[PDB]
C-alpha cells in the first residue's frame, strides 16, 4: 500500500464474532518505539564473577519486536468464557498482521523544556524472520505483549539474543547476527505493513476434564475372569500352616487389585510446599532442595516439569515447588513479592491421568525374595516413559502462552510446550521494527571516524493482529449439569476484569480451560 500524509493507512479493527464452527479474533493496539542501544549493536555477557549458573554471552540489538503470545491479547474475558464453557477443544488456524498510522516524532531538549514535533521525512524499518534464521526469542514468557485491555498503550520491547558460551567467555562456534543484513521494508508516514501466516496441523487443546479415572475404568457389577495372587502365607493359620500359594478372581471388591490395561503419565517428583508459612521447614531451600537439571555442567531449574497433579483430594493447600505457572497481580515488584500478591495455578483436573507432582510414583521390587531373604520395596521418585502410559498435557489460561517453537534437533518426544500451548515446528515468525537512524549535523571537513551523532527520535502507530480459531464442539450425553465458569452474582466491590477508580485494568484470577467433562 502507498498513500499520503493526511491519509490514515489503516482503521481500528478490534472485534470478535463466532461461526459456531470457528471463531475469528481481531485485535488492534497502539504501540510506541524508542531508539534502543543508541543505534548500536552491543556485546553483552555475564558479570566478571557475579554468578555461576547464570553465566551467559550474547548481543543487544537496536531493533524492537512485536509479540502477542498471550491469549488475553486476542480473547476478551467474556469470549474466553464462551470458549471455555462450550468447546471440547480449540486451535489456531490463520493469521493477519498489519502495521499502520505510523508517526515519527523527534524530540529536542533545548533549555529546560522538551519539545516534540513531526519529522515527516523520517522512516521506520520492518521485516519478518520467515526463514527462521534469527534466534527465536518468543515463547519464553517475556513481557511486552499486547495489553489485555484495548485502551492501554504499550512500549515495543527490545531484541536481544544469546549464544553458545563457556562461562563468561564464548566459543568459536558462537554466532553473531546483524538484522541489517536482512532485507527490510522502510516506511514513511502513510506507508503500511502487511503479513499473512498459516498455522500448521497441531492437536486441539484439552478444554475438557475426564469424568472417569484410569483405575476406575472397569465394571462395578461384574467380576474379572482373570486371576491374581493375593495370599502367600496366611492360610487357615493354626496348625501346620506356614505358607501356601493362593489366588483370587478379581471382583468389584478387589478394585485396586484388578488386572489393568494402561498406566499413568510419566513423572519427575517436585517438593511439596504449603501456602501456610508455618507448615514448612525453617530453612531456605528454593534452590538446594528443588528439582533441577544440568547441561554442560550448568544447573538449571526444572520449573514447569512434566504435567503432574498439584495436590491430592481433600487438601487444596499444598502446591508443588514451582510445579505450575504463577502469575503476578497488577502492580507488584519483580523482587520478592508477598504470597498474597501472586496467583498460583491449580492443576487438579488431570488427577485421573497424571501422577501427583509432590507425591511418589509407586512401588518397585529390587531383590530376590525367598525363605532366606525378605522382599524389598523401593519408592520410585523418577519415571521415564513406558509402553502403555497415557497422560494429559498442562493447561492454557487467559493470560498464558499460546505457542512455542519446537527446537530443531535430531529428536523430540512429545513436543508440547512445557509451559503449555501448541508446539510448532514453524510458529508465527518474528516481526522486527526499528527507527531509521538520522544523522545529526555533520562537519564541513571529512571525518573517517564512525558516526555517532544522531537526531533523537521515537516512532508510534497502530498494529493489528487477526487470528482464526478452529473449534471442537461438545458432544456429551451427560445427564446432570456440568460445571461452568461464572462471576459471583453477589453484591461486590469492584467488577471482575475491569478498570478501577483511576483507570487500571486488572485480571483478578487465572482462568483454566477444563470445565467440560469427557470420558476415557
Ligand X SMILES: Nc1ncnc2c1ncn2[C@H]1C[C@H](O)[C@@H](COP(=O)(O)O)O1
Interacting residues with ligand X between 147 and 176 (CB under 6 A): none
- What 3-state DSSP class applies to 357? coil
Partner from a second copy, ligand X, none binding residue 125, C-beta < 5-8 Å depending on class? a second copy
First and final C-alpha spacing in the chain:
52
Q: Shortest distance, CB of residue 168 to ligand X, whole angstroms?
A: 36
At 50, list the grid cell.
Answer: 557475579
Work out how close the CB of 14 gets to a second copy at its nearest, in angstroms, rounded to a whole number.
5
Q: By CB under 8 A, how many residues form the interface with a second copy?
A: 141
Q: Is 275 in the site for ligand X (CB under 6 A)?
A: no
- Part of the chain binding a second copy (CB under 8 A), chosen from 77-85, 267-275, 286-294, 410-418: 77-85
**Which lies closer to a second copy via its Cβ, residue 128 or residue 191?**
191
Q: How many residues bind ligand X (CB under 6 A)?
A: 8
List the interface residues with ligand X, window 197-226 (CB under 6 A).
Answer: 202-203
353 is written with which cell numbers? 491421568
Is the Cβ of residue 114 or residue 283 nearer to a second copy in the bound state? 114
CB of 479 to a second copy, least distance (A): 5
Q: Which of 56, 154, 177, 197 binds a second copy (CB under 8 A)?
A: 177
Q: Contact with a second copy (CB under 8 A): which of 55, 142, 329, 425?
A: 142
Q: Does 472 bind a second copy (CB under 8 A)?
A: no
140 scored as a contact of a second copy (CB under 8 A): yes
Smallest gap from residue 407 Cβ to ligand X (A)? 12
Among 153, 452, 495, 504, binds a second copy (CB under 8 A): 495
Which of ligand X, a second copy, none has residue 415 at its interface (CB below 5 to 8 Å by kind)? Answer: ligand X
The three three-digit cell numbers of residue 140, written as one number: 519464553
- As measured in angstroms, the least distance from the Cβ of 404 to ligand X is 8
CB neighbourhood size of 517 (10 A): 16
C-alpha cell at 291: 528439582
Residue 164 C-alpha from the chain's centroid: 24
185-214: contacts with a second copy (CB under 8 A): 185-191, 209-213
Looking at the Cβ atoms of 86 and 235, the one nearer to a second copy is: 86
Separation CA 520–CA 516 (nearest Å): 13
**Sign of the CA dihedral 424, 77, 142, 50?**
negative
Which partner in ligand X, a second copy, none is near 329 (CB below 5 to 8 A by kind)?
A: none
> What does 166 interact with, of a second copy, ligand X, none (CB < 5 to 8 A by kind)?
a second copy
**DSSP 8-state secondary structure symbol assigned to residue 288:** T
Q: Does 248 bind a second copy (CB under 8 A)?
A: no
Cα torsion 299, 319, 393, 511: sign:
negative
Does 64 interact with ligand X (rule: CB under 6 A)?
no
Judge whether 99 and 213 are in contact, CB under 8 Å: no
Is residue 326 within 8 A of residue 306, CB to CB? The reply is no
Burial class (CB in 10 A: 0-12, 13-18, 19+), 234: exposed
Residue 77 binds a second copy, judged by CB under 8 A: yes
Are 196 and 93 contacting, i.e. CB atoms less than 8 angstroms apart? Answer: no
Residue 232: name its binding partner from a second copy, ligand X, none (Cβ under 5 to 8 Å by kind).
none
Output the nine-digit C-alpha cell for 147: 495489553
- 3-state SS, one letter per residue, for 4-24: CCCCCCCCCCCEEEECCCEEE
Restricting to residues 407-436, name those near ligand X by CB under 6 A. Answer: 412, 414-416, 422-423
- Residue listed under C-alpha cell 547464570: 54
Of 180, 193, 189, whose CA–CA distance to 460 is shortest? 189
Please give the residues from 21 up to 50 whose contact with a second copy meets the rule CB under 8 A. 26, 28
Q: Give every CB contact of residue 417 below 8 A, 6+ residues apart in sequence.
A: 139, 401, 403, 404, 423
513 is a contact residue toward ligand X (CB under 6 A): no
Closest to a second copy by CB, 258 or 345? 258
* Residue 12 binds which of ligand X, a second copy, none (CB < 5-8 A, kind-dependent): a second copy
100 closest CA partner among 31, 158, 153: 31
DSSP-derived letter for residue 89 is: E
Give the residue among 362, 363, 361, 364 at the shortest CA–CA distance from 305. Answer: 361
Output the smallest distance, CB 421 to a second copy, in A: 22
User: Which residues of the shown chain bind ligand X in the complex (CB under 6 A)?
Assistant: 202-203, 412, 414-416, 422-423
Amino acid at each position: 500500500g502507498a498513500d499520503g500524509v493526511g491519509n490514515s493507512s489503516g482503521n481500528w479493527h478490534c472485534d470478535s464474532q463466532w461461526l459456531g464452527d470457528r471463531v475469528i479474533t481481531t485485535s488492534t493496539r497502539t504501540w510506541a518505539l524508542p531508539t534502543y542501544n543508541n543505534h548500536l549493536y552491543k556485546q553483552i555477557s555475564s558479570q566478571s564473577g557475579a554468578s555461576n549458573d547464570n553465566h551467559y554471552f550474547g548481543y543487544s540489538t537496536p531493533w524492537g519486536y512485536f509479540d502477542f503470545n498471550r491469549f488475553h491479547c486476542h480473547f476478551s474475558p467474556r469470549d474466553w468464557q464462551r470458549l471455555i464453557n462450550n468447546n471440547w477443544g480449540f486451535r489456531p488456524k490463520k493469521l493477519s498482521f498489519k502495521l499502520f498510522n505510523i508517526q515519527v516524532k523527534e524530540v529536542t531538549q533545548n533549555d529546560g523544556t522538551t519539545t516534540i514535533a513531526n519529522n515527516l521525512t523520517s522512516t521506520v524499518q520492518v521485516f519478518t524472520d520467515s526463514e527462521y534464521q534469527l534466534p527465536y526469542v518468543l515463547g519464553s514468557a517475556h513481557q511486552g505483549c499486547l495489553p489485555p485491555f484495548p485502551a492501554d498503550v504499550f512500549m515495543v520491547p527490545q531484541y536481544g539474543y544469546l549464544t553458545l558460551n563457556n562461562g563468561s567467555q564464548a566459543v568459536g562456534r558462537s554466532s553473531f547476527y546483524c538484522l541489517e543484513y536482512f532485507p527490510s521494508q522502510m516506511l514513511r508516514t502513510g506507508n503500511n505493513f502487511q503479513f499473512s501466516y498459516t498455522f500448521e496441523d497441531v492437536p486441539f487443546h484439552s478444554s475438557y476434564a475426564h469424568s472417569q479415572s484410569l483405575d476406575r475404568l472397569m465394571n462395578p457389577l461384574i467380576d474379572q475372569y482373570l486371576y491374581y495372587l493375593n495370599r502367600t502365607q496366611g492360610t487357615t493359620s493354626g496348625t501346620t500352616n506356614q505358607s501356601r500359594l493362593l489366588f483370587s478372581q478379581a471382583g468389584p471388591q478387589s478394585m485396586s487389585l484388578q488386572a489393568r490395561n494402561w498406566l499413568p503419565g510419566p513423572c519427575y517428583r517436585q517438593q511439596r510446599l504449603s501456602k501456610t508459612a508455618n507448615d514448612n521447614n525453617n530453612s531456605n531451600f528454593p534452590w538446594t532442595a528443588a528439582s533441577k537439571y544440568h547441561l554442560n555442567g550448568r544447573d538449571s531449574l526444572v520449573n514447569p516439569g512434566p504435567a503432574m497433579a498439584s495436590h491430592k483430594d481433600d487438601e487444596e493447600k499444598f502446591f508443588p515447588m514451582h510445579g505450575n505457572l504463577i502469575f503476578g497481580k497488577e502492580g507488584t515488584t519483580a523482587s520478592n513479592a508477598e504470597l498474597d500478591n501472586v496467583m498460583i495455578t491449580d492443576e487438579e483436573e488431570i488427577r485421573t491421568t497424571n501422577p501427583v507432582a509432590t507425591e511418589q510414583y509407586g512401588t518397585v521390587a529390587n531383590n530376590l525374595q525367598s525363605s532366606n531373604t525378605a522382599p524389598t520395596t523401593r519408592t520410585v521418585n523418577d519415571q521415564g516413559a513406558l509402553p502403555g502410559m497415557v497422560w494429559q498435557d498442562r493447561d492454557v489460561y487467559l493470560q498464558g502462552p499460546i505457542w512455542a517453537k519446537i527446537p530443531h534437533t535430531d529428536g523430540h518426544f512429545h513436543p508440547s510446550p512445557l509451559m503449555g500451548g501448541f508446539g510448532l515446528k514453524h510458529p508465527p515468525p518474528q516481526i522486527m521494527i526499528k527507527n531509521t537512524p538520522v544523522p545529526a549535523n555533520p562537519p564541513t571537513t571529512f571525518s573517517p571516524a564512525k558516526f555517532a551523532s544522531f537526531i533523537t527520535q521515537y516512532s508510534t502507530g497502530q498494529v493489528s493482529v487477526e487470528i482464526e480459531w478452529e473449534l471442537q464442539k461438545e458432544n456429551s450425553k451427560r445427564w446432570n449439569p456440568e460445571i461452568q465458569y461464572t462471576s459471583n452474582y453477589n453484591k461486590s466491590v469492584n467488577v471482575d476484569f475491569t478498570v478501577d477508580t483511576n483507570g487500571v485494568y486488572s485480571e483478578p484470577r487465572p482462568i483454566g480451560t477444563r470445565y467440560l467433562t469427557r470420558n476415557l
